[PDB]
Design an enzyme around this catalytic site. Structure first.
Site, PDB file in Angstrom:
ATOM      1  N   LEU A  23       0.820  -1.241   0.000  1.00  0.00           N
ATOM      2  CA  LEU A  23       0.000   0.000   0.000  1.00  0.00           C
ATOM      3  C   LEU A  23       0.846   1.282   0.000  1.00  0.00           C
ATOM      4  CD1 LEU A  23      -2.811  -0.893   2.594  1.00  0.00           C
ATOM      5  CD2 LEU A  23      -3.028  -0.901   0.114  1.00  0.00           C
ATOM      6  N   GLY A  24       1.943   1.292   0.750  1.00  0.00           N
ATOM      7  CA  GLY A  24       2.843   2.443   0.758  1.00  0.00           C
ATOM      8  C   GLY A  24       4.082   2.201   1.584  1.00  0.00           C
ATOM      9  N   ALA A  27       8.708   6.696   5.027  1.00  0.00           N
ATOM     10  CA  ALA A  27       8.888   7.352   6.339  1.00  0.00           C
ATOM     11  C   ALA A  27       8.400   6.512   7.519  1.00  0.00           C
ATOM     12  CB  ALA A  27       8.196   8.712   6.356  1.00  0.00           C
ATOM     13  N   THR A  30       7.031   0.190   5.788  1.00  0.00           N
ATOM     14  CA  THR A  30       6.229  -0.371   4.682  1.00  0.00           C
ATOM     15  C   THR A  30       4.881  -0.878   5.225  1.00  0.00           C
ATOM     16  OG1 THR A  30       8.322  -1.268   3.792  1.00  0.00           O
ATOM     17  CG2 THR A  30       6.278  -1.967   2.681  1.00  0.00           C
ATOM     18  N   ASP A 142       0.292  12.822  18.928  1.00  0.00           N
ATOM     19  CA  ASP A 142       0.492  12.837  17.462  1.00  0.00           C
ATOM     20  C   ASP A 142      -0.849  12.845  16.684  1.00  0.00           C
ATOM     21  OD1 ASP A 142       1.937  12.997  15.030  1.00  0.00           O
ATOM     22  OD2 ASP A 142       2.641  10.937  15.097  1.00  0.00           O
ATOM     23  N   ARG A 146      -3.388  12.999   9.018  1.00  0.00           N
ATOM     24  CA  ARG A 146      -2.582  11.851   8.524  1.00  0.00           C
ATOM     25  C   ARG A 146      -2.716  10.605   9.402  1.00  0.00           C
ATOM     26  NH1 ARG A 146       1.112  15.581  10.780  1.00  0.00           N
ATOM     27  NH2 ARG A 146       1.942  14.594  12.691  1.00  0.00           N
ATOM     28  N   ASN A 147      -3.007  10.796  10.694  1.00  0.00           N
ATOM     29  CA  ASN A 147      -3.229   9.692  11.645  1.00  0.00           C
ATOM     30  C   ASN A 147      -4.674   9.340  11.963  1.00  0.00           C
ATOM     31  OD1 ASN A 147      -0.444   9.419  11.749  1.00  0.00           O
ATOM     32  ND2 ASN A 147      -0.208  10.763  13.516  1.00  0.00           N
ATOM     33  N   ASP A 160      -1.894   5.370  14.928  1.00  0.00           N
ATOM     34  CA  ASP A 160      -0.512   5.784  15.152  1.00  0.00           C
ATOM     35  C   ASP A 160      -0.269   6.091  16.614  1.00  0.00           C
ATOM     36  OD1 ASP A 160       2.227   6.585  15.037  1.00  0.00           O
ATOM     37  OD2 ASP A 160       1.997   7.531  13.084  1.00  0.00           O
TER      38      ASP A 160
HETATM   39  C1  LIG Z   1       0.375   4.321   7.697  1.00  0.00           C
HETATM   40  C2  LIG Z   1      -0.566   3.747   7.306  1.00  0.00           C
HETATM   41  C3  LIG Z   1      -1.746   3.026   6.897  1.00  0.00           C
HETATM   42  C4  LIG Z   1      -2.435   2.154   7.721  1.00  0.00           C
HETATM   43  C5  LIG Z   1      -1.985   1.824   9.092  1.00  0.00           C
HETATM   44  C6  LIG Z   1      -1.759   2.792  10.129  1.00  0.00           C
HETATM   45  N1  LIG Z   1      -1.305   2.428  11.322  1.00  0.00           N
HETATM   46  C7  LIG Z   1      -1.018   1.131  11.599  1.00  0.00           C
HETATM   47  C8  LIG Z   1      -0.537   0.737  12.863  1.00  0.00           C
HETATM   48  C9  LIG Z   1      -0.239  -0.586  13.123  1.00  0.00           C
HETATM   49  C10 LIG Z   1      -0.420  -1.576  12.151  1.00  0.00           C
HETATM   50  C11 LIG Z   1      -0.887  -1.241  10.901  1.00  0.00           C
HETATM   51  C12 LIG Z   1      -1.196   0.105  10.595  1.00  0.00           C
HETATM   52  C13 LIG Z   1      -1.674   0.473   9.316  1.00  0.00           C
HETATM   53  C14 LIG Z   1      -3.556   1.607   6.936  1.00  0.00           C
HETATM   54  C15 LIG Z   1      -4.625   0.676   7.156  1.00  0.00           C
HETATM   55  N2  LIG Z   1      -4.841   0.061   8.367  1.00  0.00           N
HETATM   56  N3  LIG Z   1      -5.495   0.418   6.164  1.00  0.00           N
HETATM   57  C16 LIG Z   1      -5.335   1.025   4.980  1.00  0.00           C
HETATM   58  N4  LIG Z   1      -4.375   1.898   4.741  1.00  0.00           N
HETATM   59  C17 LIG Z   1      -3.453   2.230   5.663  1.00  0.00           C
HETATM   60  N5  LIG Z   1      -2.364   3.080   5.655  1.00  0.00           N
HETATM   61  C18 LIG Z   1      -1.913   3.935   4.532  1.00  0.00           C
HETATM   62  C19 LIG Z   1      -0.600   3.469   3.841  1.00  0.00           C
HETATM   63  C20 LIG Z   1      -0.591   4.203   2.474  1.00  0.00           C
HETATM   64  C21 LIG Z   1      -1.915   5.036   2.436  1.00  0.00           C
HETATM   65  N6  LIG Z   1      -2.543   5.389   1.137  1.00  0.00           N
HETATM   66  C22 LIG Z   1      -1.901   5.784  -0.009  1.00  0.00           C
HETATM   67  O1  LIG Z   1      -0.683   5.871  -0.068  1.00  0.00           O
HETATM   68  C23 LIG Z   1      -2.668   6.107  -1.253  1.00  0.00           C
HETATM   69  C24 LIG Z   1      -3.890   5.461  -1.594  1.00  0.00           C
HETATM   70  N7  LIG Z   1      -4.524   5.793  -2.725  1.00  0.00           N
HETATM   71  C25 LIG Z   1      -4.034   6.721  -3.548  1.00  0.00           C
HETATM   72  N8  LIG Z   1      -2.893   7.355  -3.277  1.00  0.00           N
HETATM   73  C26 LIG Z   1      -2.193   7.088  -2.169  1.00  0.00           C
HETATM   74  C27 LIG Z   1      -1.724   6.196   3.459  1.00  0.00           C
HETATM   75  C28 LIG Z   1      -1.719   5.466   4.842  1.00  0.00           C
HETATM   76  C29 LIG Z   1      -2.824   4.059   3.262  1.00  0.00           C
END
Ligand SMILES: C#Cc1c(-c2cnc3ccccc3c2)c2c(N)ncnc2n1[C@]12CC[C@](NC(=O)c3cncnc3)(CC1)C2
Ligand SMILES: [Cl-]
Length: 313
Positions: A23-24, A27, A30, A142, A146-147, A160
């Site tokens: 997914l991304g 910073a 992963t 925090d 973004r969080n 977060d």
């Molecule tokens: C950081 C993170 C995050 C989390 C997450 C957070 N904390 C956590 C703690 C512990 C364990 C796991 C955790 C997971 C997350 C999630 N549970 N489910 C969907 N997505 C997520 N993300 C993102 C990662 C990349 C993202 N999206 C794009 O980059 C994007 C999409 N579409 C078009 N353009 C760009 C921005 C944040 C989705």
């Protein structure tokens, strides 16, 4: 002292994870999406899997497991919970997949399709999550757009817990050490003195609401972080967003008061935004608010609040 934390840390076998796609990265390490099929049970659970930049650092697993500890101890509809950990060489944290991503990106991509009802609902939901953390004596440290993650456009959750700390059982503050920090979401007393309270989180909530009401604008855009404490000492604050009535902006400004006990409480923020959410167009002015699509008690009505939004400490 404090009460025993009886949360269950679940350990998940690596053979239970499938369809793993990225997914991304960068910073925050992963983040992958996947499916979790527990052993005996006929269920497929969409999940996200977090893990730091490849590596095998002993300093890194210390911070990851601190996050796991906090994230395993929370149970609320507006906070992300830890499903489990997987014990690969660097530890993997497993949570629920939030298909719509973070709220900052969501408001940026959908500027022209977000109505006042959605904006005010998100504010309520974030305030509910933060009030829950306060009842657990946790200071997030925090809070930012973004969080906040988006399960659906009707349902967001705080995430977060990397910087989260427990404000003591008899104590009423936290004093911090070194690291990296987001200056632009921090209360003044955190910048100058490293004091962190539930009320410093309220400041951060104010900035988070501002980000949403400006459809994802960078706070103090252009200004370098070393200048921020001087700006805030002079009495400058973030400007009134175009869509905001004075009613909404005054709530933000109250979150940015110098005296921390004069700021609103998360429970009061729940109440105020919930009232506003019953008549959204009275509080946010958005061009085309009727044409918005995403995937006698009338004398009383002003100050009516459902019991579910009236929360007792
Ligand atoms: C950081 C993170 C995050 C989390 C997450 C957070 N904390 C956590 C703690 C512990 C364990 C796991 C955790 C997971 C997350 C999630 N549970 N489910 C969907 N997505 C997520 N993300 C993102 C990662 C990349 C993202 N999206 C794009 O980059 C994007 C999409 N579409 C078009 N353009 C760009 C921005 C944040 C989705
Ligand atoms: Cl208030």
């Amino acid at each position: 002292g404090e009460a025993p934390n009886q949360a269950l840390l679940r350990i998940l076998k690596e053979t239970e994870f499938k369809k793993i796609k990225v997914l991304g990265s960068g910073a925050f390490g992963t983040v992958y999406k996947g499916l979790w099929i527990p052993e005996g049970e006929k269920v497929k659970i969409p999940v996200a899997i977090k893990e730091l930049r490849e590596a095998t650092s002993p300093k890194a697993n210390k911070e990851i497991l601190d996050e796991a500890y906090v994230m395993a101890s929370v149970d609320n509809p507006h906070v992300c919970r830890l499903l489990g950990i997987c014990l690969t060489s660097t530890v993997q944290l497993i949570t629920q997949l939030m298909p719509f991503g973070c709220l900052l990106d969501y408001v940026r991509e959908h500027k022209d399709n977000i109505g006042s009802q959605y904006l005010l609902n998100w504010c309520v939901q974030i305030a509910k999550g933060m009030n829950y953390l306060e009842d657990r004596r946790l200071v997030h440290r925090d809070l930012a757009a973004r969080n906040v993650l988006v399960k659906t456009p009707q349902h967001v959750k705080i995430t977060d817990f990397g910087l989260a700390k427990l404000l003591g059982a008899e104590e009423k503050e936290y004093h911090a050490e070194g690291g990296k920090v987001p200056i632009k979401w921090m209360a003044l007393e955190s910048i100058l003195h490293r004091i962190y309270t539930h009320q410093s989180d309220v400041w951060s909530y104010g900035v988070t609401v501002w980000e949403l009401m400006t459809f994802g604008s960078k706070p103090y855009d252009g200004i370098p972080a070393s200048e921020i404490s001087s700006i805030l000492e002079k009495g400058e604050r973030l400007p009134q967003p175009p869509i905001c009535t004075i009613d909404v902006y005054m709530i933000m400004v109250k979150c940015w008061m110098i005296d921390a006990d004069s700021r609103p409480k998360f429970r009061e923020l729940i109440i105020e935004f919930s009232k506003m959410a019953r008549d959204p167009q009275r509080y946010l002015v958005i061009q085309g608010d009727e044409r918005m699509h995403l995937p006698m008690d009338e004398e009383d009505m002003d100050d009516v609040v459902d019991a579910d939004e009236y929360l007792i400490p």
